[PDB]
Each structure stands twice: as C-alpha cells, then as structure tokens.
Amino acid sequence: CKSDVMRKIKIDKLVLNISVGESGDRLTRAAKVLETLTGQTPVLSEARYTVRAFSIRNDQIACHVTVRGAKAAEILEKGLKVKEFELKANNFSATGNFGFGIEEHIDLGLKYDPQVGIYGMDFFVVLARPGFRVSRRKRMQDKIGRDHLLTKEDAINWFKETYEGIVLNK
Template identity: 75%
Template sequence: MSANKSNANKSNKSSKSNEKDKTPTVNAMRELSIEKLVLNICVGESGDRLTRAAKVLEQLTGQTPVYSKARYTVRSFGIRRNEKIAVHVTVRGPKAEEILERGLKVKEYELKRSNFSETGNFGFGIQEHIDLGIKYDPSIGIYGMDFYVVLGRPGARVSRRRKSQKKIGFNHRVTKDETIKWFKQRFDGIVLNR
C-alpha cells in the first residue's frame, strides 16, 4: 500500500513540475523601476523669480526644493560664479510615478528618441506648470520645468554602496532600447524617431 502512495506522489510532483515549465517565468531582477524623478526649474538669475519658482516646486511635490549655483561667471548671461540660478527637487516612490504621469499627460505621452540617454534614463520639459493641475497664482506667474527620470534594476546598489563596491555587468545595465520598450508598455507612449 505504501508503494502505491509513493508512486502516486511521484506522479503528482511530475505533473506539477510540467505545469510550471509551461508558463514563462519572469526574472524579478530584470524588471525596470523608477529610481527617482528630478524636477528642475532654471531661472537664470537669483532673487524674487527664483523664490517663486521654489514655491511652484513645493506646491507640486510637497518637498523643500534645493537651490543650484552657477559653476562659473558668464558675462553675456549676467550670472556670477556661485550665484543661485535654479531650483530642483528629487522625488522617489509612488509620488514620483504620480507626478511623472501628470507630466507625460501634458506631453500627450509622446517623446522623441533623443529624449532617451544611452544609460537608460530619459527627460523632457514642459512649457507651463499650470498644465500639471496647479491653480494659477498671479503673484507667482508661470514657469516651465524639466523632468529627468532615472530607471534602475534591483541590485544596482552594488555599484553605489560604500563597502565592497563592484561594477554592474553589461547584461544587467539599463540600455536605451530597454527604456523605450518600458515606456511604451507602461504608459502606452509614442516614441518619435527624431
């Protein structure tokens, strides 16, 4: 009787393994995800316009923006070295996905091929921040902004950690074509060949 049970168990196990072999497995380590979204407004001068641009980013993200300084003096632009000329904020997690969705809706989910970098990141700009659903405030005005999206795979920390830093292999790095494919699948986006 015990021999019959063991034979029955073996046949059940083999039928289960056949079922698993039929479905294509997806490697969870190969899936792309948004690591971060950086929103940038470059005003080109310090002062009142820059603080108003910071208010726009704070309204949009709910985070305190950081000021960026000029690297060197450019007389023709009227900027001096170390003068605050831009504001940016880094957003991660579900909030980043929600803001990116709103930004792509403004662009009608249409990007150029040149918007995508060779390292698997992409960026685009919008002309008016009020298109994102922020109410127009006459005291602030209208600002355009840049969106920069960094994509990554699980395991990328290996190249950034402090101890035992290693390089990521070429087959695990994010490429331009993989990012374009992810963008088309995730957002039903259109990539123009320009």
C-alpha cells in the first residue's frame, strides 16, 4: 500500500532543438530531419533580438519539437547510445532536468546527400513525477511540494537505475 508508486520518475518531455544562424533552405532541411526522427512537424523559432554579430528579428533562427510517452523514451535511447551512456555530472540541472548535444545525426546513412547535409542536434530531457499536473492545469493551479519536486541527485540516480549510464565527474 506504500505510496512509492506515486513517486516514480518518468520522462514526460524531450525537446530536440536545432539552431542555425540563417533562415531559408537549410532551415527547411533542419526541419526535415526533425520530422523524420520524431514524426511531427516541428515549430520554427524566430529571433527575439536582432544582432549583427550573429547576422540575425522576425527571421526564423532555430527549430525544435518535443516528444512524450514511448516515443520520447525510444528517441532518448538513441541519443544516449550514440553518447555511449556517458553523461558528465555537470549536465544535470538543479531542477532535475538534464541535456546534451549530438554532433552527427545518424538518421539515414546509405542515401546521405549534400542536399540533406549534416546537422548537430541537442537533447534536453525534462523529468517528472505523477502529480506534477497541479502546476500545469487550468483550474486550481498550485506549486508542487519541495519534497515531491525533483532535485539534481534524483535525476542522476534515475539515469543510473534506468540506463546504467555512469556519471562523469572529471
């Protein structure tokens, strides 16, 4: 009857974001690989501040998409697999989230063409526990208790107990 079932961590959101300093052509390719990997059309993020150093307002800089459920878990497995399940101890946020970056997207390897190109992708994983909806719903919004909230070490332990991926301290 122990309420530990109400305290089990579960990946509730996985955001993949690709950032490119130009809009057009290559942005469509960046959105194209995201569609193949996940299966849903991404959202093209537009710049908020124009800076001539980066050659960037209304122009769309980056694209991103989030996946939840079994799709997020299987996509995350590839990202950790290509990372050899090696995650440094500084990657984990104080709020219980973590992330990393992927240089080469495997996607398709046989028919890779310069038209598609090569793209670097980042993976950010948001962890959650049952009951987090109280801060997300529309009626009677509150704040999750501190003891229920995830910290850095709960996320680190979860990564070790679910994928056996050791942590790097150096």
